[PDB]
């Protein structure tokens, strides 16, 4: 399946061999880029005077004269004919005839190309990919693999912006980058030339800026340094700050200045782009006037940043066209998918969908913010180059096939099972969801109640849930082990562990929903209990970052299945055989008692308890540890210690309850007399 596809495409059924003798015509004129793509198609085959005919080149090149009048007079665009007398490769510029290239590529199977003739060319000018995420930032090496990606896939924008690089932000933005840093961006700026990419610097200097001559000139030397290193791309963010630094006026001036006195001065500069403070619809305030006043202020030429209706939202006809009115320019979407950096303990590897397909012309660019994973997002950068250029015929499911095929040939299926079942973001302030195993779900769905109730599920929904959980772990174990693309396994790997533990814990389940015999049913259930304390060891011990730490997977429709089968099946037993079996379905060493229902979790260091979206009101709550712990503070949010329940020793509290416990021992914690917030804080491992 050719990705992107072609505006125009017809497709006569003929194939033709590739050919062993051929003439190149056009290759010292054509696009270098192009040439050396073509000629690495072409190893082991002769070229000579004699032989099928190979015309490569841009309009207005001796080599493609003949096709000038089918060549599409777009920008980016190409002509690109195959029959069983000449090759032909035309762009209408060198862009053009490199994009003709990667088409090219992707027809060659079996050394055979089919007869067909494409005219081809991009519905949005930009595309590409916006490293603006909060994070740790792409390495050197995944960057250098992202851009070969995007060349592939046409994508022609790289707008480098990791909000955690000091010297990208602030206040370090003012100060060039170490001799290191900068040999690392020139090389990324040389490979970004030879796959047609533009390499944009962005900088983020709001927070700190002040609106004078030093730290003007501070900017504009800076961007003159990334100049040297090759940059010939440049962009300003303002988006998350306050002060001074949120005023649309001098953002304006400011950036007109940078065009003027830099963009329009130097000869080869290509995109300047700024992101608004206000970067979506909701959180533009209607009181004053922001948007309007960039519009009108800024120069036309200079692009502005968008999000949607929301900080994450899909974009939508009614969306783009009110941000386009205030602007007065067509909008450079700036889409948070599948950037995770607010849910880091969810990987997003469903497919690419939500934004309309027809409005193309509505907008200046369009851009995708990914994960930290550089790997694991390119199956969502896959699918944005695919709507991006052809977002008429652009096909949700099939590109998200075609990326992870595209991705790991080798195991494609087993990835897709993996990506099927790890798409949704869980709850998040945003409020921003997605669709998670869709397949099942159905089944899943009849499943719970009739199990539930006293009727009975349907043997083909049992089924369905043990052959799921067959093949979950089946592209587990394989995907562990898979070669062909290291640094995405190094990436999913803690959630592949996780994920196969899911998948075991629910064929335990099953197998404890037929029941049989009584010693049979303690065998699972014991079972089923160390696999909850092997999944709460993998969320203790993998990806602790200091927001969304641990490893969850598959939450929308398989864990809550699971969970709730567990708890149901157990309730059967202990009214049965009048047992007293433990329904918990997340394990938790510690205990509390007293809010009633609400369970524990352990953040790193922290023991809390889950908040509620109720209204609370000399009762008290206790917490009892595992153990004894030094204790850092108890942070409550709307007290009494002891490290063994009969010695108490009181505590005094201070909007937030701070409360010191000075590395003093403990082990139980009470509060005698709404809850936003109830943390334990301990020393660290
Ligand atoms: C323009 C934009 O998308 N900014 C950040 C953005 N976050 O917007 C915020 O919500 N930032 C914020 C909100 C309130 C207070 C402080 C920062 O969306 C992405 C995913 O969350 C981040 O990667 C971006 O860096
Ligand atoms: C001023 C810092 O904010 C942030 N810090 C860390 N992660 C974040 C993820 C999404 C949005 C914001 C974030």
Same mark, same amino acid.
């Given at each position: 399946?050719? +990705?992107?596809?072609?505006?125009?495409?017809?497709?006569?059924?003929?194939?033709?061999?590739?050919?062993?003798?051929?003439? !190149?015509?056009?290759?010292?004129?054509?696009?270098?880029?192009?040439?050396?793509?073509?000629?690495?198609?072409?190893?082991?085959?002769?070229?000579?005077?004699?032989?099928?005919?190979?015309?490569?080149?841009?309009?207005?090149?001796?080599?493609?004269?003949? /096709?000038?009048?089918?060549?599409?007079?777009?920008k980016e665009?190409?002509?690109?004919?195959?029959?069983?007398?000449?090759?032909?490769?035309?762009?209408?510029d060198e862009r053009?005839?490199?994009?003709?290239?990667?088409?090219?590529?992707?027809?060659?199977?079996?050394?055979?190309?089919?007869?067909?003739?494409?005219? %081809? /060319?991009?519905?949005?000018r930009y595309?590409g990919?916006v490293?603006?995420?909060?994070?740790?930032?792409?390495?050197?090496?995944?960057? !250098?693999?992202?851009?070969?990606?995007?060349?592939?896939?046409?994508?022609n924008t790289y707008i480098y912006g990791?909000?955690?690089?000091?010297?990208h932000?602030?206040?370090?933005w003012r100060?060039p980058?170490?001799?290191?840093?900068?040999? +690392?961006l020139?090389?990324?700026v040389?490979?970004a030339n030879?796959?047609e990419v533009d390499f944009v610097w962005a900088i983020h200097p709001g927070? &700190?800026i002040?609106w004078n001559k030093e730290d003007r000139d501070l900017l504009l030397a800076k961007f003159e340094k990334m100049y040297q290193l090759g940059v010939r791309s440049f962009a300003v963010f303002f988006?998350?700050?306050?002060?001074?630094?949120?005023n649309p006026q001098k953002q304006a001036e400011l950036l007109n200045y940078i065009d003027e006195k830099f963009a329009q001065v130097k000869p080869d500069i290509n995109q300047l782009v700024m992101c608004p403070?206000?970067?979506?619809?909701?959180?533009?305030?209607?009181?004053?006037?922001?948007?309007?006043t960039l519009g009108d202020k800024l120069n036309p030429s200079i692009q502005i940043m968008?999000?949607?209706?929301?900080? $994450?939202?899909?974009?939508?006809? %009614?969306?783009?066209?009110?941000?386009?009115?205030?602007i007065k320019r067509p909008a450079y979407?700036?889409?948070?998918?599948?950037?995770?950096?607010?849910?880091?303990?969810?990987?997003? !590897?469903?497919?690419?969908?939500?934004?309309?397909?027809?409005?193309?012309?509505?907008?200046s660019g369009?851009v995708?913010?990914?994960?930290?994973?550089?790997?694991?997002?390119?199956?969502?950068?896959?699918?944005? #180059?695919?709507? #991006? =250029?052809?977002?008429?015929?652009?096909?949700?499911? +099939?590109? =998200?096939?075609?990326?992870?095929?595209?991705?790991?040939?080798?195991?494609?299926?087993?990835?897709?099972?993996?990506?099927?079942?790890?798409? %949704?973001?869980?709850?998040?302030?945003?409020?921003?969801?997605?669709?998670?195993?869709?397949?099942?779900?159905?089944?899943?769905?009849?499943?719970?109640?009739?199990?539930?109730?006293?009727?009975?599920?349907?043997?083909?929904?049992?089924?369905? @849930?043990?052959?799921?959980?067959?093949?979950?772990?089946?592209?587990?174990?394989?995907?562990?082990?898979?070669?062909?693309?290291?640094?995405?396994?190094?990436?999913?790997?803690?959630?592949?562990?996780?994920?196969?533990?899911? #998948?075991?814990?629910?064929?335990?389940?099953?197998?404890?929903?037929?029941?049989?015999?009584?010693?049979?049913?303690?065998?699972?259930?014991?079972?089923?209990?160390?696999?909850?304390?092997?999944?709460?060891?993998?969320?203790?011990?993998?990806?602790?970052?200091?927001?969304?730490?641990?490893?969850?997977?598959?939450?929308?429709?398989?864990?809550? !299945?699971?969970?709730?089968?567990?708890?149901?099946?157990?309730?059967?037993?202990?009214?049965?055989?009048?047992?007293?079996? %433990?329904?918990?379905?997340?394990?938790?060493?510690?205990?509390?008692?007293? $809010?009633?229902?609400?369970?524990?979790?352990?953040?790193?260091?922290?023991?809390?308890?889950?908040? #509620?979206?109720?209204?609370?009101?000399?009762?008290?709550?206790?917490?009892?540890?595992?153990?004894?712990?030094?204790?850092?503070?108890?942070?409550?949010?709307?007290?009494?210690?002891?490290? &063994?329940?009969?010695?108490?020793?009181?505590?005094?509290?201070?909007?937030?309850?701070?409360?010191?416990?000075?590395?003093?021992?403990?082990?139980?914690?009470?509060?005698?007399?709404?809850?936003?917030?109830?943390? @334990?804080?301990?020393?660290?491992?």
């Amino acid at each position: 399946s050719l +990705q992107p596809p072609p505006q125009q495409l017809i497709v006569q059924n003929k194939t033709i061999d590739l050919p062993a003798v051929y003439q !190149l015509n056009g290759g010292e004129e054509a696009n270098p880029h192009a040439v050396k793509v073509l000629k690495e198609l072409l190893s082991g085959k002769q070229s000579s005077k004699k032989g099928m005919l190979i015309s490569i080149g841009e309009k207005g090149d001796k080599s493609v004269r003949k /096709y000038s009048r089918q060549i599409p007079d777009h920008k980016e665009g190409y002509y690109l004919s195959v029959n069983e007398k000449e090759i032909v490769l035309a762009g209408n510029d060198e862009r053009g005839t490199y994009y003709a290239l990667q088409t090219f590529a992707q027809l060659l199977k079996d050394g055979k190309l089919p007869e067909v003739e494409i005219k %081809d /060319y991009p519905s949005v000018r930009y595309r590409g990919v916006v490293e603006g995420f909060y994070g740790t930032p792409w390495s050197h090496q995944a960057r !250098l693999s992202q851009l070969k990606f995007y060349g592939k896939n046409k994508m022609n924008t790289y707008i480098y912006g990791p909000k955690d690089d000091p010297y990208h932000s602030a206040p370090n933005w003012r100060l060039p980058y170490p001799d290191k840093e900068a040999a +690392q961006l020139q090389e990324l700026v040389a490979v970004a030339n030879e796959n047609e990419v533009d390499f944009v610097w962005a900088i983020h200097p709001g927070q &700190d800026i002040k609106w004078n001559k030093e730290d003007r000139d501070l900017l504009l030397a800076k961007f003159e340094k990334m100049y040297q290193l090759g940059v010939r791309s440049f962009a300003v963010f303002f988006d998350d700050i306050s002060g001074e630094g949120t005023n649309p006026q001098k953002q304006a001036e400011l950036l007109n200045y940078i065009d003027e006195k830099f963009a329009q001065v130097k000869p080869d500069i290509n995109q300047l782009v700024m992101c608004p403070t206000e970067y979506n619809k909701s959180w533009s305030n209607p009181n004053g006037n922001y948007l309007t006043t960039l519009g009108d202020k800024l120069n036309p030429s200079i692009q502005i940043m968008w999000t949607g209706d929301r900080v $994450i939202s899909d974009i939508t006809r %009614d969306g783009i066209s009110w941000i386009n009115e205030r602007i007065k320019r067509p909008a450079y979407i700036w889409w948070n998918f599948p950037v995770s950096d607010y849910v880091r303990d969810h990987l997003l !590897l469903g497919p690419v969908y939500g934004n309309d397909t027809t409005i193309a012309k509505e907008m200046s660019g369009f851009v995708t913010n990914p994960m930290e994973h550089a790997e694991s997002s390119k199956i969502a950068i896959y699918s944005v #180059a695919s709507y #991006a =250029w052809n977002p008429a015929k652009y096909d949700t499911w +099939q590109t =998200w096939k075609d990326a992870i095929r595209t991705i790991l040939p080798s195991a494609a299926e087993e990835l897709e099972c993996f990506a099927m079942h790890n798409s %949704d973001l869980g709850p998040n302030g945003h409020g921003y969801r997605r669709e998670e195993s869709m397949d099942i779900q159905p089944a899943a769905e009849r499943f719970l109640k009739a199990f539930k109730e006293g009727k009975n599920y349907d043997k083909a929904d049992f089924e369905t @849930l043990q052959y799921t959980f067959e093949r979950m772990k089946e592209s587990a174990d394989i995907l562990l082990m898979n070669t062909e693309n290291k640094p995405l396994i190094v990436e999913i790997t803690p959630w592949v562990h996780q994920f196969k533990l899911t #998948a075991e814990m629910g064929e335990e389940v099953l197998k404890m929903v037929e029941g049989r015999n009584e010693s049979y049913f303690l065998r699972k259930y014991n079972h089923v209990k160390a696999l909850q304390q092997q999944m709460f060891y993998i969320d203790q011990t993998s990806n602790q970052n200091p927001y969304q730490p641990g490893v969850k997977t598959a939450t929308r429709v398989i864990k809550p !299945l699971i969970d709730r089968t567990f708890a149901t099946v157990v309730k059967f037993f202990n009214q049965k055989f009048n047992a007293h079996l %433990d329904a918990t379905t997340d394990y938790m060493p510690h205990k509390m008692i007293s $809010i009633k229902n609400l369970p524990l979790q352990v953040k790193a260091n922290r023991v809390l308890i889950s908040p #509620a979206n109720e209204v609370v009101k000399g009762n008290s709550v206790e917490i009892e540890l595992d153990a004894i712990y030094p204790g850092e503070n108890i942070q409550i949010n709307f007290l009494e210690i002891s490290t &063994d329940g009969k010695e108490w020793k009181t505590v005094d509290l201070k909007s937030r309850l701070s409360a010191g416990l000075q590395k003093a021992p403990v082990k139980f914690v009470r509060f005698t007399n709404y809850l936003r917030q109830f943390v @334990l804080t301990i020393e660290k491992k």
